[PDB]
Structures are given as structure tokens and as C-alpha cells.
């Protein structure tokens with residue numbers, strides 16, 4: 008498809024800094040070229056320059072609110088631009104707090120978007136339910152219209168406007184959900200397939216239901232926010248908050264291959280890849296290679312093979 | 321639920337001794353605290369003191385019959401006690417020969433119990449069919465009423481009374497079954513899901529059929545005897561008789577999460593964890609961590625999340 | 634069943650030479666004995682002596698055409714012999730180019746054979762579509778009647794006669810298919826289950842459809858060409874062209890256990906095991922052990938257990 012690459016070297020949504028290297032190691036893995044090696048029209052909007060905000064004391068327990076709120080605000084504008092250019096936005100990021108700006112900017116051009124969130128976590132803590140204060144675990148709370156009222160005025164986010172309903176999002180891969188988050192899950196009726204549902208139904212049925220659930224009433228643009236820690240750490244170890252028992256490399260590709268086939272992918276986030284956290288050089292390459300593979304699947308690379316519309320014989 | 325912890329540091333059901341450390345490393349992993357950290361009422365009945373039986377020569381090929389028969393006899397009494405106290409017995413053990421006493425004592429208070437046996441092995445060899453002579457591979461033969469007649473008078477087990485029928489037990493995870501054992505399997509019509517059935521049906525259907533098979537006619541207490549070598553050695557390597565191609569960490573949790581949801585768990589055995597057999601310190605922690613995870617799942621810990629009955633928002 | 638072992642220490646179908654050691658390390662793993670330890674009548678036709686062909690320059694891009702064409706020609710004769718002796722041919726090989734002779738010789742005695750090809754690749758490149766020139770990636774193109782016309786007169790293969798139709802073959806495990814190969818796939822209507830279909834349907838349904846697809850109209854002899862790189866490299870690392878995201882050890886055994894149960898297995902190839910490519914001594918033993926396990930499954934070894942027709946009690 009027509010892609011618009013946007014690097015988001017940001018890490019203040021959490022404590023470990025190496026995550027802002029995500030765009031670099033991914034590009035250095037030949038991501039742009041690989042995409043071009045397919046049927047992809049690729050334009051790199053470069054890495055966004057996230058100005059330093061020296062004065063950013065916590066808002067209550069919440070950390071680096073101004074820099075996070077600013078990075079998402081900046082990212083939101085960029086995504087809206089690439090979307091206005093008729094391209095699928097590919098946000099190579101740092102931490103997942105950036106999802107706030109990516110989904111926000113996407114919904115400005117396509118307010119009817121549906122979101123598929125692959126993650127070991129729900130990232131739906133509010134500034135009042137979070138125990139860690141890390142904003143990469145709160146993005147979803149800022150985007151949900153139903154949680155509009157339980158989100159205090161946090162410095163840096165006054166530009167935010169909830170753009171999606173609890174019913175326009177589906178979670179896949181959950182295995183470490185906080186108590187308040189689970190409460191929000193059940194209270195708002197959010198559709199999710201934790202690792203338990205994946206085990207019960209199999210990833211094939213999981214994807215069937217996910218797409219049917221989001222595209223049933225009518226076809227609508229799809230936003231895929233892929234947190235690499237959604238996959239098992241044996242595949243993506245170089246990430247900040249790994250949790251054992253994750254989705255397999257195969258399941259990761261199955262998810263993306265199916266989304267690609269809908270022809271409705273319009274926004275994509277590949278987040279939380281932190282090279283600095285690899286215990287070895289191999290753990291880093293393994294994490295980056297897996298991250299690239301998932302990305303390519305979103306844009307056509309199929310395991311059964313691919314061929315141009317010509318007579319090869 | 322209401323739990324009654326009972327440590328069973330015993331190893332004479334087999335050759336390698338480190339298995340009697342099971343209760344120690346598990347407790348030292350914070351098992352009691354972790355359970356309390358949930359909605360669990362926990363009372364530790366301590367570790368049973370298994371007196372040394374210096375004079376215990378083999379009965380034919382069978383090894384350490386008196387100490388094994390004695391340990392199970394002692395364990396049987398303890399379990400019956402905790403069951404009489406309205407608690408779910410949690411037997412942290414050494415080798416699986418202890419299942420004889422755990423299931424025996426359980427059935428004294430709840431004669432209508434159904435058993436789910438997760439294991440790479442059937443542990444149903446008789447003193448006459450066993451080739452190794454290790455009693456941890458014969459527990460089931462002593463408990464089955466139908467095998468009453470093919471079990472010789474082995475020193476230390478005169479207190480035993482078969483308490484379950486071949487139809488009140490279901491095996492899950494089998495992948496190394498001896499010839500005589502397989503014969504007993506097919507001859508008594510025992511329900512089992514070897515790794516082949518798990519591969520064919522998927523763990524979801526496997527659990528559906530298992531519970532339906534055992535709880536169909538009527539709801540009855542459930543005894544789960546979990547041999548950690550039922551899971552693949554990439555998850556539980558620190559165990560005496562590992563067999564490749566086992567159940568996954570995910571499947572292990574799926575099994576237990578489903579059993580928990582029945583609200584019928586009344587007896588649980590977490591066996592065969594041998595710290596001494598870990599090739600590295602990490603293999604030990606990996607085995608113990610997995611063993612703890614499975615245990616917590618049996619008592620409520622869910623991958624989709626958990627929350628108290630309060631308004632978190 | 635009645636087996637006829639034939640070693641094929643050949644490697645010129647590709648660049649790395651250690652693959653010709655396949656027969657050796659497999660035999661040294663106790664394969665013959667293990668088979669005999671079952672209900673198998675085993676006769677080893679020894680290792681075929683593949684005379685050196687010093688003068689063998691490439692035919693266009695195709696490498697070592699004369700030695701490859703000769704090795705398959707020799708192998709074809711041997712297989713036909715063992716098949717004429719009422720035995721299931723077990724070809725312990727080097728590279729997969731040998732499939733040309735194995736399937737050719739098999740079809741001479743049983744022209745109605747159906748083929749199950751487990752592989753990460755389709756190995757259906759023609760001498761004109763191949764980019765590497767390695768013949769181990771072209772065997773299928775020489776065997777298909779429908780591709781009769783797109784296969785130039787390559788030195789060493791004038792003895793070849795396409796013996797199977799595109800509809801008498803099923804692929805399982807595909808995850809690295811070239812563009813021209815994919816074109817041939819879709820153009821000839823070849824049935825395949827890439828890793829994507831395995832993920833979607835589960836290996837149980839995959840095998841159900843495969844057998845139904847090949848044995849539907851009528852029961853016919855089965856030829857299983859098993860490329861060990863079809864399984865994930867975490868199980869069979871010592872192989873020339875490994876591809877991540879492969880079939881599991883369990884799936885590998887499920888496939889073979891199901892084929893065995895049809896009672897129609899008549900030809901088997903266990904290919905691409907290259908001991909020289911193991912990064913460690915353990916990677917070699919792990920590859921060989923897995924290869925032996927799959928082989929034993931093809932001839933009866935079942936994970937649920939096995940027993941002779943006698944009264945064990």
C-alpha cells in the first residue's frame with residue numbers, strides 16, 4: 008500500500024531511555040528498503056524532533072506529563088498530515104504513550120476508525136488509577152470518550168479530545184492487567200482477547216471475531232497499535248515490560264497478515280522496542296527482526312508467497 | 321478460595337533426592353504471600369516430618385516401599401484433616417508417589433471426587449508391570465478399584481483402599497507411556513488426552529471435554545494432581561523425568577484457569593519440582609516461577625486481570 | 634510396518650556439503666535398532682555410492698546438474714527395488730534434490746501415489762525460474778506433468794518422466810516461497826497449507842483436510858517427503874536453509890502420527906539434516922533426535938503409548 012513513515016524517538020512515557028532508539032535500529036534494519044522491495048509506495052517523513060522540556064515535574068503521581076503530552080500533540084499533527092496525503096501512517100516509536108497522538112491525529116482525518124491493540128497490557132490506566140505514574144500505561148484512558156470525566160487536567164494534554172468509544176477498540180494478547188484497568192474493561196464493555204481467549208479459541212477464530220466485531224456494521228479504517236511486548240519475550244526480549252506466555256511469532260504474523268488482507272489498514276504503530284534492554288546483541292537483532300517482520304506483514308508480505316501480476320513461466 | 325498448604329518433602333518414590341526441596345523453594349518464592357495477595361484464606365499446615373526408615377529393602381523390583389507407603393499414609397491423614405477444616409488442600413510435594421496419600425485422604429472426606437492428572441506420564445504401572453521399580457510411576461495403580469487384585473501386598477501399603485474408578489480420572493499431557501500402562505489404559509477405558517489429542521483438538525476443546533466428562537452427570541469435588549513434567553522442559557526443566565514436546569506455559573495456565581472457574585477445585589498437588597536438577601540457577605527459578613504461576617491460576621489469578629468488587633473509578 | 638532403509642549421502646543439490654553425512658548421524662543415532670524396537674521389519678539397503686562426476690559445469694544458472702541428475706537416477710532405481718520387495722522405502726538423505734529420484738522410483742511401482750511435502754519451501758522452481766541455481770529447490774518442477782514443457786533439457790535428467798499431477802501433492806509448512814514458485818502454485822491449483830493456514834486452522838484440521846484431499850476419491854499409496862527445515866529451527870537447527878516460525882516438534886509428530894494411522898505410507902524421505910551446520914554439538918543432537926522421532930512416528934511410535942497384543946496384567 009501507500010505508506011507514510013514517521014519516526015517518534017520518544018521515551019518519557021516510561022523510565023528506561025533506550026526506547027527512543029526504536030526508529031534508528033528499525034530503519035537500520037532496512038525497513039524502508041524492504042517495504043519498497045514489495046508493492047509499497049514509501050515516503051519517510053523523518054524522525055520528529057521532540058524538544059527538551061527541562062521543567063516537567065510530576066502531576067501528582069504522573070511523570071513527565073508535559074513532554075509526553077507535547078510529543079503526542081506533535082505526533083498527532085504529523086499523522087493527520089500523512090493521512091491527508093492519502094498514506095497509511097507508520098509510526099516507528101519509542102514508548103506506547105505516543106499512541107495518544109497517533110490515534111488522535113488519525114481520527115481527525117478518519118473519525119470512524121476502529122482500533123486493534125496488540126499488547127500484553129491494556130494501557131488504560133487513568134492518572135488516578137495508575138500506580139507507576141508512567142504514561143505509556145495510560146494512553147487508552149485519554150482516548151476513550153466514556154472516560155471523559157475521570158481524566159484530570161494533566162499538564163500537556165489540554166489539546167486532547169477523546170476520539171473513540173469503548174466499542175471501537177479490540178485488545179489482543181493481554182496477560183498483565185491492573186485491577187482498576189480490569190474494572191474499566193468490564194464496566195465499559197470493552198472487547199478483548201487475553202491470552203486465555205487466544206488459548207481457548209485459537210488465533211484464527213480470534214482474528215475472525217475481532218474483524219467481524221469491528222467491521223460488522225460497516226467497513227471503516229483500521230488503526231493497529233502494536234506493542235512488541237504483546238509477543239512472547241522469546242521473540243521480542245528487547246522491550247521494557249516483558250511478560251512470559253505471549254503471542255508467538257507465528258500468531259504475530261497471523262494477526263498482521265489478516266489485517267493486511269482487509270485492505271482497511273490506515274494507521275500502524277510499532278512500539279516499545281528498546282535495543283538498550285537486549286541482554287545480548289542477538290536479543291536485539293531478534294527483537295528488531297521480529298518487529299520488521301510484523302511490519303512487512305501489515306503491508307503485504309505473505310508466508311504463502313507473493314508474486315507480481317505477470318506470467319512467470 | 322480457602323486454602324490449606326501442606327508441604328511434603330519426600331523423594332523415595334524415585335532415585336534423585338533434590339525433589340524433597342520442592343516445598344522449600346516454592347515457599348521461598350513467596351507462594352503463601354502471593355496467594356494471600358489474592359482473594360485467598362491461607363493456612364500453612366507446615367511440612368510433614370517423614371521419619372527415616374533405615375530398613376526398607378525392595379519388594380521384588382519395587383524400591384523403598386515402606387518409606388513411600390508410610391509417607392502417603394501420613395499425607396493422607398493430613399489432607400483429610402485440612403479437608404475436614406473446609407479448606408482446599410495444596411500439597412507442595414517431592415515425587416508423585418505422594419499422590420497415593422493425597423488422593424486417598426481427599427476421598428475419605430469427599431468419596432465422590434473426580435481427578436484431573438496433568439503429566440507427561442500415566443503413573444499407572446503396577447508393582448508387577450513397572451520396569452524401573454520407582455513408586456512415583458505407580459501411584460494411580462494403587463488408587464484404582466478396577467486394579468484391585470493385580471496389586472500385590474507391598475510392605476507399607478496395607479492401609480490403602482482403592483478410592484476411585486477408572487472413569488473418575490482424566491489424563492492430560494501424556495507423551496511417554498509404558499506398554500503395560502497403555503494396555504491398562506485401553507482395557508479399563510480410561511479417558512485421556514495425550515499430546516496428540518491436545519494437538520488435534522486444541523487445549524480449549526480438551527478442557528471442555530475433560531470438565532464435561534467429569535462433571536457431566538453431576539457436579540463433584542475436583543482433585544488436580546499436577547506433575548510439573550507435564551509441561552515442556554523449556555518451562556519446567558528442573559524435574560527428574562523430562563520429556564520434550566510438552567504442554568506450553570500458556571496451556572498450563574489455561575488448564576488451571578478453567579479448573580478454577582468451575583469453583584469445584586478441592587484438592588491440588590504440585591509435584592516433581594527438583595531444584596537440584598536445574599542445569600543453571602535460571603533453570604531452577606524458571607521451573608519454580610512456572611510452578612507458582614500454575615498454582616496461583618488454580619486459585620483465581622487470571623490473565624485477563626482481576627479486580628475487587630468496588631468502584632475503581 | 635515393513636521398511637527398506639536406503640542411505641543417500643548426497644549434497645550437490647546445494648552449496649554446503651555436510652548434508653551428505655545425514656545417513657551417518659541418523660544411523661549412529663540408533664535409527665535401525667529403534668525401528669526394530671517397534672513392530673518393524675527392517676532391511677537396510679545400505680548407503681548408495683554416488684560416483685564422483687568431476688566434469689559438471691553449470692547448465693546456464695543450474696549447478697551440478699549431472700551429479701544431481703545421476704544421484705536421483707540411481708536413487709530411483711533403488712527405491713523401485715525396495716518397493717518391489719513389498720517394503721516402505723525410507724530414504725535417509727542429504728539435500729532435497731534427491732526427491733526427484735525417490736518419488737520417480739516410487740511411482741514406477743505405484744503410479745497412483747499421493748505426495749505430502751512438509752517443508753518451509755515449495756522446492757518447485759524450474760531451471761528457468763530459479764535464482765540460486767541450487768537443484769534442491771527445484772525437485773517438484775521435474776516431477777509435475779503440468780510443468781512438462783517449461784523444463785529445458787538439463788544434462789543428467791533425460792531419464793526423467795513427470796509422474797505426478799499438481800493435484801496429487803499437498804504442501805504443509807510453507808513460509809519462504811519465491812515469486813515464480815507462488816505463481817506456479819496458484820496457476821496449477823496446487824493444494825497447500827502454509828504456516829498461515831496452520832495458524833488459522835490448527836494442525837488437526839490441516840491434517841484432516843490433507844488426507845481427505847489426497848485420499849477422498851480413493852485410497853492410494855502415500856509418499857511423505859519430509860524436509861527437516863519445515864520444522865522450526867529451534868527443533869532442527871542443523872540444516873542449510875532454516876526459516877523462523879516453523880512447525881513445532883508437536884506438530885511434526887502430529888503430522889506423522891496421522892499419516893501412520895492411514896496405513897497407507899509407502900514412501901518416506903527425511904532430508905536436509907546437515908550436522909556440519911550445527912552451531913554446537915547440542916544443536917546437532919537436537920536436530921538428529923527430532924529427525925529420528927519424526928521417522929519413528931511414521932512407523933507406529935505413538936505419544937499416547939504402544940503395546941503388543943498380549944495381556945499385560
Ligand SMILES: N[C@@H](CCCC[C@@H]1CO1)C(=O)O
Nearest residue numbers: 103128132139143144234248
Ligand atoms: N500497567 C502497568 C504496566 C504498563 C505497561 C505499559 C506498556 C506500554 O505497554 C503500568 O501502568 O505501569
Ligand SMILES: N[C@@H](CCCC[C@@H]1CO1)C(=O)O
Nearest residue numbers: 416441445452456457547561
Ligand atoms: N513410566 C516410567 C516413568 C515414570 C515417571 C514417573 C513420574 C512421576 O511422574 C516408570 O514407571 O519408571
Ligand SMILES: N[C@@H](CCCC[C@@H]1CO1)C(=O)O
Nearest residue numbers: 729754758765769770860874
Ligand atoms: N527457493 C530457494 C530456497 C530453496 C530451499 C530448498 C530447500 C530444499 O528445501 C531456492 O530456490 O534456492
Ligand SMILES: [Mn+2]
Nearest residue numbers: 127128234236
Ligand atoms: Mn505492553
Ligand SMILES: [Mn+2]
Nearest residue numbers: 103126130234
Ligand atoms: Mn503498550
Ligand SMILES: [Mn+2]
Nearest residue numbers: 440441547549
Ligand atoms: Mn511425569
Ligand SMILES: [Mn+2]
Nearest residue numbers: 416439443547
Ligand atoms: Mn507424575
Ligand SMILES: [Mn+2]
Nearest residue numbers: 753754860862
Ligand atoms: Mn526447505
Ligand SMILES: [Mn+2]
Nearest residue numbers: 729752756860
Ligand atoms: Mn526441501
